[PDB]
Protein backbone atom coordinates (compact mmCIF):
# COMPACT_ATOMS: atom_id res chain seq x y z
CA UNK A 1 0.00 0.00 0.00
CA UNK A 2 1.05 3.53 -0.68
CA UNK A 3 -0.48 6.84 -0.06
CA UNK A 4 -2.99 7.93 -3.19
CA UNK A 5 -0.43 9.33 -5.80
CA UNK A 6 -0.94 12.73 -5.96
CA UNK A 7 -0.38 14.06 -9.36
CA UNK A 8 -2.70 13.65 -11.99
CA UNK A 9 -1.97 15.04 -15.26
CA UNK B 1 -0.43 33.68 -17.24
CA UNK B 2 2.48 33.30 -15.09
CA UNK B 3 4.51 32.47 -11.95
CA UNK B 4 6.15 34.47 -9.83
CA UNK B 5 8.27 34.14 -7.02
CA UNK B 6 9.24 36.66 -4.00
CA UNK B 7 11.85 36.49 -1.01
CA UNK B 8 15.17 35.78 -1.87
CA UNK B 9 17.34 37.58 0.08
CA UNK B 10 20.69 37.41 2.13
CA UNK B 11 20.42 35.74 5.51
CA UNK B 12 22.90 34.49 8.07
CA UNK B 13 22.52 30.48 9.05
CA UNK B 14 19.89 29.76 11.63
CA UNK B 15 17.52 33.07 9.89
CA UNK B 16 14.37 31.82 9.39
CA UNK B 17 13.32 33.41 5.94
CA UNK B 18 10.22 32.69 3.93
CA UNK B 19 9.69 32.16 0.12
CA UNK B 20 6.13 33.37 -1.20
CA UNK B 21 4.89 32.16 -5.00
CA UNK B 22 2.47 34.15 -6.92
CA UNK B 23 0.03 32.90 -9.89
CA UNK B 24 -1.21 35.77 -12.28
CA UNK B 25 -4.44 34.78 -15.07
CA UNK B 26 -5.85 31.57 -12.74
CA UNK B 27 -6.59 29.79 -9.59
CA UNK B 28 -3.78 29.30 -7.19
CA UNK B 29 -5.85 25.78 -6.51
CA UNK B 30 -6.22 24.48 -10.05
CA UNK B 31 -2.88 23.13 -10.76
CA UNK B 32 0.05 21.08 -9.36
CA UNK B 33 2.42 24.06 -7.05
CA UNK B 34 5.86 22.91 -6.58
CA UNK B 35 8.60 24.47 -5.16
CA UNK B 36 12.03 23.50 -6.91
CA UNK B 37 15.72 24.56 -6.17
CA UNK B 38 19.11 24.73 -7.93
CA UNK B 39 22.30 25.88 -5.95
CA UNK B 40 24.82 27.65 -7.93
CA UNK B 41 26.38 25.47 -10.95
CA UNK B 42 24.06 22.45 -9.84
CA UNK B 43 21.20 20.35 -10.66
CA UNK B 44 17.25 20.84 -9.79
CA UNK B 45 16.18 19.61 -6.96
CA UNK B 46 12.23 18.94 -6.01
CA UNK B 47 11.31 20.39 -2.82
CA UNK B 48 7.68 19.71 -2.29
CA UNK B 49 4.11 20.30 -3.83
CA UNK B 50 0.94 21.07 -3.02
CA UNK B 51 -1.32 18.82 -4.85
CA UNK B 52 -4.45 20.25 -7.15
CA UNK B 53 -6.09 16.17 -6.67
CA UNK B 54 -5.65 14.85 -2.85
CA UNK B 55 -5.16 18.89 -1.94
CA UNK B 56 -2.69 17.33 0.03
CA UNK B 57 1.03 18.70 0.81
CA UNK B 58 4.06 16.53 -0.03
CA UNK B 59 7.88 16.80 0.43
CA UNK B 60 10.91 14.92 -0.60
CA UNK B 61 12.55 12.81 2.05
CA UNK B 62 15.18 15.07 2.05
CA UNK B 63 13.74 17.73 2.72
CA UNK B 64 11.10 17.07 5.56
CA UNK B 65 11.51 19.63 8.56
CA UNK B 66 13.92 21.67 6.31
CA UNK B 67 11.15 23.37 4.52
CA UNK B 68 7.58 24.18 5.48
CA UNK B 69 5.22 24.58 2.56
CA UNK B 70 1.49 26.49 3.22
CA UNK B 71 -0.98 28.56 1.00
CA UNK B 72 -2.31 31.99 1.94
CA UNK B 73 -5.38 33.76 0.49
CA UNK B 74 -2.88 34.43 -2.40
CA UNK B 75 -0.03 32.74 -2.27
CA UNK B 76 2.16 29.29 -2.36
CA UNK B 77 4.66 30.06 0.16
CA UNK B 78 8.07 27.59 1.09
CA UNK B 79 9.81 28.26 4.75
CA UNK B 80 13.30 27.34 5.08
CA UNK B 81 13.28 26.75 8.69
CA UNK B 82 17.00 27.07 9.78
CA UNK B 83 19.09 27.72 6.96
CA UNK B 84 22.50 26.72 6.32
CA UNK B 85 25.40 27.30 3.69
CA UNK B 86 24.22 24.54 1.12
CA UNK B 87 20.56 26.28 1.18
CA UNK B 88 22.34 29.16 -1.00
CA UNK B 89 20.10 28.47 -3.94
CA UNK B 90 17.89 29.80 -6.69
CA UNK B 91 14.11 28.57 -5.62
CA UNK B 92 11.66 28.32 -8.13
CA UNK B 93 7.69 27.49 -8.13
CA UNK B 94 6.21 25.73 -11.04
CA UNK B 95 2.55 25.31 -12.02
CA UNK B 96 0.75 22.13 -13.61
CA UNK B 97 1.70 18.60 -12.92
CA UNK B 98 4.47 17.97 -15.21
CA UNK B 99 6.13 21.89 -13.45
CA UNK B 100 4.49 23.06 -17.43
CA UNK B 101 4.66 26.88 -15.77
CA UNK B 102 7.97 28.43 -14.07
CA UNK B 103 8.64 31.40 -12.47
CA UNK B 104 11.69 32.94 -12.84
CA UNK B 105 13.43 32.30 -9.45
CA UNK B 106 14.62 33.61 -6.73
CA UNK B 107 18.18 33.72 -4.83
CA UNK B 108 18.58 32.64 -1.04
CA UNK B 109 22.20 33.64 -0.01
CA UNK B 110 22.62 32.12 3.35
CA UNK B 111 26.21 33.60 4.82
CA UNK B 112 28.01 35.75 7.05
CA UNK C 1 14.10 6.42 -6.28
CA UNK C 2 17.17 7.54 -8.34
CA UNK C 3 16.66 8.66 -11.99
CA UNK C 4 20.14 8.10 -13.27
CA UNK C 5 20.63 10.22 -16.68
CA UNK C 6 23.46 9.23 -19.14
CA UNK C 7 25.84 10.69 -20.43
CA UNK C 8 26.56 13.63 -18.26
CA UNK C 9 27.48 15.68 -21.72
CA UNK C 10 27.06 14.86 -25.08
CA UNK C 11 28.19 16.51 -28.18
CA UNK C 12 26.40 17.03 -32.11
CA UNK C 13 27.38 19.38 -34.83
CA UNK C 14 24.38 21.77 -36.32
CA UNK C 15 21.93 18.93 -38.20
CA UNK C 16 23.06 15.94 -35.87
CA UNK C 17 21.23 13.83 -33.97
CA UNK C 18 21.61 13.60 -29.86
CA UNK C 19 20.40 10.30 -27.76
CA UNK C 20 19.89 11.10 -23.67
CA UNK C 21 18.98 8.17 -21.55
CA UNK C 22 17.19 7.92 -18.18
CA UNK C 23 17.06 4.92 -16.33
CA UNK C 24 14.61 4.28 -12.97
CA UNK C 25 15.86 1.80 -10.43
CA UNK C 26 12.35 0.48 -10.36
CA UNK C 27 9.35 1.19 -12.20
CA UNK C 28 7.99 4.76 -12.44
CA UNK C 29 4.33 5.36 -11.80
CA UNK C 30 1.99 3.74 -14.43
CA UNK C 31 5.21 2.93 -16.25
CA UNK C 32 5.03 6.56 -17.78
CA UNK C 33 5.40 9.52 -15.44
CA UNK C 34 8.60 10.68 -16.80
CA UNK C 35 9.24 13.90 -18.19
CA UNK C 36 12.13 16.05 -20.10
CA UNK C 37 13.34 19.72 -19.05
CA UNK C 38 15.36 22.12 -21.27
CA UNK C 39 17.97 24.40 -18.94
CA UNK C 40 19.59 27.21 -20.48
CA UNK C 41 21.92 28.74 -17.90
CA UNK C 42 20.28 32.04 -16.40
CA UNK C 43 16.84 30.56 -17.48
CA UNK C 44 13.97 28.88 -15.68
CA UNK C 45 13.39 25.18 -16.92
CA UNK C 46 11.17 24.60 -19.53
CA UNK C 47 8.80 21.30 -20.06
CA UNK C 48 9.74 19.84 -23.14
CA UNK C 49 8.31 16.16 -23.19
CA UNK C 50 5.55 14.57 -20.63
CA UNK C 51 3.96 11.23 -20.29
CA UNK C 52 7.50 9.67 -21.65
CA UNK C 53 6.65 10.73 -25.19
CA UNK C 54 3.83 13.59 -25.46
CA UNK C 55 5.25 16.96 -26.61
CA UNK C 56 4.23 19.78 -25.37
CA UNK C 57 2.61 22.59 -26.70
CA UNK C 58 5.00 25.27 -28.66
CA UNK C 59 7.97 22.67 -28.58
CA UNK C 60 9.89 21.89 -31.68
CA UNK C 61 9.16 17.98 -33.30
CA UNK C 62 12.85 17.58 -33.53
CA UNK C 63 12.54 16.72 -29.30
CA UNK C 64 11.30 12.83 -28.79
CA UNK C 65 10.46 11.23 -26.06
CA UNK C 66 10.44 6.70 -25.89
CA UNK C 67 10.37 4.02 -23.65
CA UNK C 68 8.25 2.77 -20.21
CA UNK C 69 9.33 1.61 -17.06
CA UNK C 70 12.66 1.56 -16.62
CA UNK C 71 14.03 2.98 -19.37
CA UNK C 72 13.79 6.47 -21.08
CA UNK C 73 15.43 7.95 -24.04
CA UNK C 74 15.46 11.71 -25.24
CA UNK C 75 16.18 12.21 -28.76
CA UNK C 76 16.82 15.47 -30.53
CA UNK C 77 17.21 15.52 -34.12
CA UNK C 78 18.65 18.14 -36.48
CA UNK C 79 20.20 19.87 -33.89
CA UNK C 80 20.47 23.57 -33.57
CA UNK C 81 22.60 25.67 -31.74
CA UNK C 82 19.10 26.90 -29.68
CA UNK C 83 19.48 23.45 -28.67
CA UNK C 84 22.72 24.00 -26.36
CA UNK C 85 21.96 23.26 -23.13
CA UNK C 86 21.31 21.00 -20.29
CA UNK C 87 18.52 18.97 -20.22
CA UNK C 88 16.52 16.82 -16.92
CA UNK C 89 14.57 14.09 -16.75
CA UNK C 90 11.99 13.93 -14.28
CA UNK C 91 10.39 10.60 -12.75
CA UNK C 92 7.31 9.84 -10.30
CA UNK C 93 6.71 7.23 -8.18
CA UNK C 94 4.65 5.36 -6.02
CA UNK C 95 4.79 6.97 -3.21
CA UNK C 96 4.92 10.11 -4.29
CA UNK C 97 8.63 10.11 -5.04
CA UNK C 98 9.56 12.65 -8.01
CA UNK C 99 13.01 12.73 -8.03
CA UNK C 100 15.42 14.39 -11.29
CA UNK C 101 18.23 13.01 -12.65
CA UNK C 102 21.47 14.68 -12.69
CA UNK C 103 21.14 16.21 -16.09
CA UNK C 104 23.37 16.56 -19.51
CA UNK C 105 24.82 19.03 -21.20
CA UNK C 106 24.81 19.32 -25.16
CA UNK C 107 27.23 20.87 -26.50
CA UNK C 108 26.65 22.31 -30.09
CA UNK C 109 29.88 21.44 -31.42
CA UNK C 110 31.45 23.13 -35.52
Known amino acids: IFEKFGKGG | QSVEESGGRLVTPGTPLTLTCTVS????????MSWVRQAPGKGLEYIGFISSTTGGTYYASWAKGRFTISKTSTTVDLKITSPTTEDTATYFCAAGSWYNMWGPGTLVTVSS | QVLTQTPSSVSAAVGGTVTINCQASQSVYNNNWLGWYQQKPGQPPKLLIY???TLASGVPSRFRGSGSGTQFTLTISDVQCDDAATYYCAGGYNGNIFPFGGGTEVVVTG
Open chain 3, 51 to 53: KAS
Open chain 2, 25 to 32: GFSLTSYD
